[PDB]
Amino acid sequence: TTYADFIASGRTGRRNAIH
Amino acid sequence: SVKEFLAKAKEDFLKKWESPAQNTAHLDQFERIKTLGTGSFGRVMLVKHKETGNHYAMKILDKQKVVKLKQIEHTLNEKRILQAVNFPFLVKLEFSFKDNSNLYMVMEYVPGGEMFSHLRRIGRFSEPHARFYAAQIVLTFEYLHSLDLIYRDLKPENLLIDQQGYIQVTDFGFAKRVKGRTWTLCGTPEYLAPEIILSKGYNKAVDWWALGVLIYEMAAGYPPFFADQPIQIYEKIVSGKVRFPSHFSSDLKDLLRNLLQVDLTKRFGNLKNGVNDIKNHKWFATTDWIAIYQRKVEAPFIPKFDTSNFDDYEEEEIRVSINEKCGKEFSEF
Numbered sequence: 139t140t141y142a143d144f145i146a147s148g149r150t151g152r153r154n155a156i157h
Numbered sequence: 158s159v160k161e162f163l164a165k166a167k168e169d170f171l172k173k174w175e176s177p178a179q180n181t182a183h184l185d186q187f188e189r190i191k192t193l194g195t196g197s198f199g200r201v202m203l204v205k206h207k208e209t210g211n212h213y214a215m216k217i218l219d220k221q222k223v224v225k226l227k228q229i230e231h232t233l234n235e236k237r238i239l240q241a242v243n244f245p246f247l248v249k250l251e252f253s254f255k256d257n258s259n260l261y262m263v264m265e266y267v268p269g270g271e272m273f274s275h276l277r278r279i280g281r282f283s284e285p286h287a288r289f290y291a292a293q294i295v296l297t298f299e300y301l302h303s304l305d306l307i308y309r310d311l312k313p314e315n316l317l318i319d320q321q322g323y324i325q326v327t328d329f330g331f332a333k334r335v336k337g338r339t340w341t342l343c344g345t346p347e348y349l350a351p352e353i354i355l356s357k358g359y360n361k362a363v364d365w366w367a368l369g370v371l372i373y374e375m376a377a378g379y380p381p382f383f384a385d386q387p388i389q390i391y392e393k394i395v396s397g398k399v400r401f402p403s404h405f406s407s408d409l410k411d412l413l414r415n416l417l418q419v420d421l422t423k424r425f426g427n428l429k430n431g432v433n434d435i436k437n438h439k440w441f442a443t444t445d446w447i448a449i450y451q452r453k454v455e456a457p458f459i460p461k462f463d464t465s466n467f468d469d470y471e472e473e474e475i476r477v478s479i480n481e482k483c484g485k486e487f488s489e490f
């Protein structure tokens with residue numbers, strides 16, 4: 139599932155802005 | 158009328174924009190309690206104003222870090238804009254000042270924590286729950302854009318929940334007052350409009366694309382474009398091929414196709430009828446826009462009452478150098 143793919147991804151924590 | 162309200166909103170803003178508040182408190186006036194959040198330049202701490210016992214959130218920016226990241230003008234924008242705005246769903250800048258080492262922005266303390274925290278914990282919001290928040294962002298962007306301001310960093314991390322369950326937008330680090338178009342590559346990868354990624358020049362339409370991403374993320378529990386590396390995220394965005402969860406309502410999907418529209422001449426919020434294409438959309442049929450603005454609507458969630466709605470962060474001493482750093486750069490702050 140897409141949800142499972144998200145939760146296993148490296149992008150579920152706070153996301154940095156691009157500076 | 159709305160046009161009338163905004164015109165008056167603008168009169169108020171321009172006075173403060175042309176003559177910004179400066180040096181309105183000092184560090185020793187506040188007792189520092191605990192870090193509530195962090196960011197590239199520093200941290201935000203819960204503090205208590207000694208003379209009144211009021212609590213605030215003090216954002217502390219290391220001047221040298223700002224300069225290293227080439228964010229001087231952006232930081233000057235942040236403070237000049239925030240001190241000038243006034244809207245129910247925008248965090249208030251109560252005081253600002255600087256010292257040899259840091260810039261300080263003392264803002265309204267919003268006790269319910271980040272939308273990010275609640276969204277990740279609960280998984281996803283119901284459509285009515287998401288709609289309630291979305292409505293507040295729509296009104297806030299209507300206000301900001303009418304002042305020629307682009308926000309440029311919408312995401313759940315930047316949306317705080319107050320004691321009554323309403324949203325307060327924080328972090329104006331990329332906010333900018335601009336007539337026409339601009340070019341800076343800035344924002345958060347998942348939330349970037351295609352035109353930003355493609356270096357096309359862009360305008361306030363990027364905030365409306367970002368609203369689409371936010372609404373999708375609130376309702377799905379994950380954003381419409383994600384991957385372990387930003388490059389791959391950018392590739393997905395520019396394709397614009399979006400897939401919706403099977404539980405998304407027909408109305409929701411329709412709204413999202415119009416917000417997550419790669420074509421600027423078709424993107425909602427950016428057409429002849431502007432924000433009204435969004436307000437009048439079927440997904441918002443149940444939304445009373447005046448009641449939202451007046452905070453007369455019962456929130457779908459009120460936070461439990463104290464800083465337990467925020468994560469714990471590592472603390473560090475706030476050392477102030479005996480030498481002034483970057484004085485010329487931040488003269489106007």
Ligand SMILES: COc1cccc(CC(=O)N/N=C/c2c(C)cc(O)cc2O)c1
Pocket residue numbers: 193194195196197198199200201213214216217218248264265266267268317327328329330
């Ligand atoms: C780029 O450098 C940065 C350094 C520190 C912080 C940030 C991001 C920011 O403005 N957070 N605001 C948190 C906040 C909180 C947690 C509560 C509150 O009441 C008001 C706030 O602004 C960016």
